[PDB]
Amino acid sequence: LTETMPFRMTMEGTVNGHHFKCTGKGEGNPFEGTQDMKIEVIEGGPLPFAFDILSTSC
Amino acid sequence: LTETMPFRMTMEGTVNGHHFKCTGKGEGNPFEGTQDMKIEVIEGGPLPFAFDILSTSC
Amino acid sequence: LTETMPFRMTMEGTVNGHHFKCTGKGEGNPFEGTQDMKIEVIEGGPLPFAFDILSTSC
Amino acid sequence: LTETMPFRMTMEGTVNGHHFKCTGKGEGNPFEGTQDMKIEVIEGGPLPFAFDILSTSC
Amino acid sequence: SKTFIKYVSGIPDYFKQSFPEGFTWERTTTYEDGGFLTAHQDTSLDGDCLVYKVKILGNNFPADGPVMQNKAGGWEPGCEILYEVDGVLCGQSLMALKCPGGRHLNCRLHTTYRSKKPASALKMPEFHFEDHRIEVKEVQKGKHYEQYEAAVARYCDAAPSKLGHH
Amino acid sequence: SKTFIKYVSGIPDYFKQSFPEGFTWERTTTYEDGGFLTAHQDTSLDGDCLVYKVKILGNNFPADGPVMQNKAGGWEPGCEILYEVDGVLCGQSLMALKCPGGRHLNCRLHTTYRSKKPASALKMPEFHFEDHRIEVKEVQKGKHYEQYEAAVARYCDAAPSKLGHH
Amino acid sequence: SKTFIKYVSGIPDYFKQSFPEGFTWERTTTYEDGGFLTAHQDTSLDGDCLVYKVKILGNNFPADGPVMQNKAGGWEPGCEILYEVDGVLCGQSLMALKCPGGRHLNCRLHTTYRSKKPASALKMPEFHFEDHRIEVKEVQKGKHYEQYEAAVARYCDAAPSKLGHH
Amino acid sequence: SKTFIKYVSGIPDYFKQSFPEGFTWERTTTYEDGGFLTAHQDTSLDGDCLVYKVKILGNNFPADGPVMQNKAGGWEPGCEILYEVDGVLCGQSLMALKCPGGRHLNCRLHTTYRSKKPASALKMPEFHFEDHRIEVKEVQKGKHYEQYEAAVARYCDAAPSKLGHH
């Protein structure tokens, strides 16, 4: 690993019958424990529920 | 047992900080599985919460 | 609906990190409330967990 | 409050059918957030269950 | 008040068997909106009179909820499942409290029933169900109530086995 | 497979009413030993055939538990309570898994059933019970199974009301 | 014993503010293996002495478990989150009991803290954390114990905001 | 995204130790108002890039709740407890969702982290805490988001031991 590690993400789910897909990318410092990312809802947008429930999964 | 059996009850408790005491008197058919009772709040009345929460204890 | 009614099923999941897929077919009497079905594990077999946990989903 | 404060405790309870009573005596530094106490089982001893379940109540 | 149950299908009656010694029960009821109601009960036979002693601790009921607002409308009929655990009888049930606007508030009862009789003198029932109906009349607001209950212990006859199980 | 239920006492059938559009359900089952089983299901009518599509996520099942050890003995018959919440049909049930040595492992099912018809086109049922029995035969180790179920929807006739309630 | 907490970062002290009237607390602790421990506590100031009165109801602890077998090895340090609900202070915490073989048994504490002071005289704290360490010494088996606790109330300084939140 | 944690006090890093093989996690989050959010995640290292694949099933979120009404205000910072069970790493946390009017909605995270290395090739960490802060910016309504997180793994240094413990 390096001190700035990039990451890539894909997400698919159903919440209260609403299907959606997300993608994301970001970067962080693995050793300082910090990270940033962008998330885009590519299917099922605009999200009909609070994005907050997906935060711990991203 | 006998096909009609009397019972008596004493109950004391605290719910959400409210202290209370109840007494009870009833009778029922033990083998037919039916019963009736009277309940009186003797301390902490009138009850400041739904009596329904006490039903399964009476 | 008819008095003998057929159904088919496809199932996909992950349990404790184990990926699996199932298919099924059956029939029942919708109005009598009875049904029977066959379930086959087509991927991730032999199931490394009790099939019982999937019964209510089938 | 004073930087060293004494306290005394009485407890009554039933756990899994076992009735018990405890008394307690301690002191602590309220602004420094530290405290020590002695607990004695005065009824229902020796306790037939882990005292640990009472710790957050003492 | 578990002495008053009609048993069918040759199911042994854990509660009536417990006399003359009697029995206790202990329960925590967990409400879907955060309330907890915990109880311990002692049941004894005193001559020709059953004697109940109850201790209650209830907490975390939302101030805005039907319980604390005193706007509950009684319980729906309920189904309890009962089976042996650790040589005593355990009970598990979901109940539904009627609320304003045709709404319900649900809760789960976690019960252990404890005979005061030694295991050697008791016939433990197999897994079974108890149907309960509790109906309450408020005679004087927060002071005087009347309660009726009917209970039946049974197997699942309504949905038959094809392996000849109960 | 909620299309296959016998409804008595004139209780409206949420599921049969939903066709030809069909319905979905969603559930999380919480096991007493820490396991979770979450499911989403789509039910459609394809001419003469019912089509089910199921997605499953299960987690936290103990390695030493009867689920992961594959030592489960099937389910006891069960009771579900059903009532309207938010203009859809909610279901709540406790189930008991048979385990070695005459033991049971309990779990709670939290279900929402969603018609693909609008609520305005439906006759919503009152609070009621559904009795279920599920029986499984393992034809081939971890590969082939046969499953039987019977289900009845009813009110509490076993324990009658004194206040004219269902 | 909530009077003994070190507050940092200008967080108001709900418990010390409550004197001379004092406060109560109420809690249900739910154990992962089925046990429940419910408590109500009254805290008063009597001259130069704090007086605690505690009521306990515990139930459904497995006979085979570390609690009933008396094989527990004390608590790990714990973190509680505290915040206003219904004009009182609520507390939520997970704790982990040390068990034989380097194992842990977890539980959840659902607490409400109730000042006996009117709201008008109280500064309610923002959302914050209390770190707790409880250590126990068994002096005489099942009869005499010693308990030490250290507690600190704080915000999350270890993982800082990029928005200027606490 | 558990690769990005600062480990202090010589606590072994379960996740960093898992590379090049990577790891998975699985979680059910239970919400106090009845919602469930279940997730499975795969983490792989593709040369110089980390790849995450996530599957989500969420259900039973009340229609009138802050989640379905899209009125949540982000998470409070949080604390997770982590310790070994069954030769893998388990995580337990309470989180609090900020809601309109200074209110919070709490939830519990039940997690298992699974290395793709065998346990014998890993140094498993002792019981410890992970402090987490998640902050979200909604760039475009229900379409684009930015997320920041900071995370530290530590022992309880805030409340010190008298018995030489972490």
* CATH assignment at residue H40: 2.40.155.10
What is the per-residue DSSP string for B1-58? --SSEEEEEEEEEEETTEEEEEEEEEEEETTTTEEEEEEEEEESPSPSS-GGGGGGG-
> DSSP secondary-structure letter at G15?
H
Residues of E in contact with D16 (CB under 8 A): 26, 112
Selection from D10, D43, H165 nearest residue G148 by Cα:
H165
Interface test with C, best of H18, H21, H25, H26 (most C CBs within 10 A): H26
Q: What is the interface size between D and E, counted as CB pairs within 8 Å?
A: 9
Backbone angles phi, psi at E15, to 5 degrees: -80, -50
Q: Measure C53 CA to nearest chain H CA, in Å.
A: 16
- Number of structural domains chain F divides into: 1
Query: Distance between CA atoms of D18 and E85, rounded to whole angstroms?
Result: 18
- D-proximal residues of G, 96-155, CB under 8 Å: 97, 109, 134, 136, 138-139, 141-153
Residues of A in contact with F114 (CB under 8 A): 17
Q: Is D30 helix (H, G, I), strand (E, B) or coil?
A: coil
Q: Measure D3 CA to nearest chain G CA, in Å.
A: 10
- The first and second tokens of residue E160, run together, are 């038959």
Query: Distance between CA atoms of F151 and C33, rounded to whole angstroms?
Result: 5
8 Å CB contact of E40 and G55: no
**What is the residue type of H40?**
H
Sequence-separated (6 or more) residues with CB below 8 Å from residue F90 = F82, F83, F84, F111, F112, F113, H60
CA F95 to chain centre: 10
Residue F40 in contact with partner chain C when CB distance is under 8 A: no
Contact of chains D and B by CB distance (3 or more pairs under 8 angstroms): no
8 Å CB contact of D16 and E26: yes
Residues of F in contact with H30 (CB under 8 A): 30
8 Å CB contact of D14 and E40: yes
Compute, in degrees rounded to 10, the torsion defined by CA atoms H13, H16, H19, H22. 90
**What is the residue type of D54?**
L
Per DSSP, which regions of chain F are E strands?
Answer: 6-7, 23-31, 36-46, 49-59, 78-85, 88-99, 103-115, 128-140, 144-154
Rg (alpha carbons) of chain E, rounded to whole number: 17
Query: Distance between CA atoms of C37 and C56, rounded to whole angstroms?
Result: 13
Domain region containing H145: 1-166
Query: Distance between CA atoms of A44 and A22, rounded to whole angstroms?
Result: 9
> DSSP secondary-structure letter at G17?
H
8 Å CB contact of G59 and E36: no
**Experimental technique behind these coordinates:** X-ray
Residue G53 in contact with partner chain B when CB distance is under 8 A: no
Rg (alpha carbons) of chain B, rounded to whole number: 13
Sequence-separated (6 or more) residues with CB below 8 Å from residue E26 = D14, D16, D17, E39, E40, E41, E111, E112, E114, G57, G59, G60
8 Å CB contact of H84 and G102: yes
Q: Measure D20 CA to nearest chain E CA, in Å.
A: 14
Residues of G with CB under 8 A from a CB of E: 26-28, 30, 34, 36, 38-40, 55, 57, 59-60, 62-64, 85-87, 90, 110-112
8 Å CB contact of A41 and H143: yes
8 Å CB contact of F129 and E79: yes
CA diameter of chain B: 41
CA diameter of chain A: 40
Per DSSP, which regions of chain G are E strands?
Answer: 6-7, 23-31, 36-46, 49-59, 78-85, 88-99, 103-115, 128-140, 144-154
Sequence-separated (6 or more) residues with CB below 8 Å from residue B55 = E75, E134, E136, E147
Residues of G in contact with D44 (CB under 8 A): none
- CA-based end-to-end distance of chain D: 20
Can you give the CATH number for the domain in which D26 is found? 3.30.1300.40
- For tokens 């009909």, the residue is A48
Domain region containing A30: 1-58
Q: Give Cα separations from A17 to A44, F38, F39, F124, G29 (angstroms).
A: 11, 13, 11, 19, 34
- Number of structural domains chain D divides into: 1
Interface test with E, best of G29, G36, G40, G61 (most E CBs within 10 A): G36
Report whether the peptide linkage leading into residue E12 is cis, meaning its omega lies within 30 degrees of zero.
Answer: no
Q: Is G2 helix (H, G, I), strand (E, B) or coil?
A: coil
> DSSP secondary-structure letter at E11?
-
Residues of H in contact with F34 (CB under 8 A): 110
Do B21 and B42 form a contact (C-beta atoms < 8 A)?
Answer: yes
> DSSP secondary-structure letter at F162?
S
Residues of G in contact with D13 (CB under 8 A): 54-58
What is the per-residue DSSP string for H98-163? EETTTEEEEEEEEEEEEESS-GGGS-PPPSEEEEEEEEEEEEETTTEEEEEEEEEEE---SS--SS
Report whether the peptide linkage leading into residue B6 is cis, meaning its omega lies within 30 degrees of zero.
Answer: no
Residue B56 in contact with partner chain G when CB distance is under 8 A: no
Residues of G in contact with D32 (CB under 8 A): 6
F89: closest chain H residue by CA: H60
Q: Give Cα separations from D21 to D52, E141, G69, G143 (angstroms).
A: 15, 36, 20, 10
Query: Distance between CA atoms of H131 and A33, rounded to whole angstroms?
Result: 10
8 Å CB contact of E34 and H34: no
Q: What is the interface size between F and H, counted as CB pairs within 8 Å?
A: 60
Beta bridge partners of D34: D29, G150
